[PDB]
């Protein structure tokens with residue numbers, strides 16, 4: 130069709146409309162569904178990203194890299210590229226909406242939430258006799274929170290986009306399965322560590338089993354061996 134912008138430009142426009150009057154323009158549910166529809170059409174070749182295959186990882190190379198596409202105050206738009214056998218560790222997205230689309234390879238995504246009384250749960254404190262492996266230091270026991278592990282599935286470019294909300298599937302872990310993988314990620318609002326909106330990491334405690342099952346979650350510092358460095362984005366530019 131004549132004069133159509135690139136798909137990635139149109140994704141960026143729609144995320145901007147989604148996450149920021151006669152006739153009435155779309156509301157949030159309609160805009161979210163349109164954003165989702167655009168992401169379902171996106172292929173790696175639309176970003177000029179050749180699928181990557183396996184090559185031992187030198188200790189100085191990042192396990193994961195990041196391609197910056199665009200960002201505003203409303204959203205961030207970029208690509209994460211995982212090397213073989215790497216993992217984006219379990220983390221949350223506080224108060225955020227998220228949408229991701231696998232471009233190549235296969236990822237295991239585990240989706241979780243911390244219990245929230247605003248949803249009709251009655252979150253309880255960890256019981257004192259409940260023990261774990263490894264055992265919990267006293268300051269760690271006080272910091273444990275209950276949560277629920279909702280799903281743990283493999284996703285490829287043929288899967289629908291994966292969506293999260295402030296209150297549903299807000300925690301996830303992404304493991305690269307059977308070689309390298311990459312996905313396009315939209316986050317809204319973006320992280321802002323200077324304004325106290327950081328990426329928080331977690332571990333699921335193993336005590337002393339189908340889904341969904343309740344679990345115990347402990348926040349933890351970013352792992353020593355996890356870091357994500359930028360690399361050039363080769364696809365169509367998002368203007369301006």
Ligand SMILES: NNc1nncc2ccccc12
Pocket residue numbers: 188189190353354355356
């Ligand atoms: N930004 N660099 C790094 N950040 N965190 C962990 C690292 C581990 C090995 C090499 C580089 C690392």
Ligand SMILES: NNc1nncc2ccccc12
Pocket residue numbers: 193209217220222301303314328357
């Ligand atoms: N699910 N992906 C991610 N979500 N939030 C923050 C991230 C930071 C680094 C790498 C991946 C991230």
Ligand SMILES: [Co+2]
Pocket residue numbers: 220221222301
């Ligand atoms: Co994430």
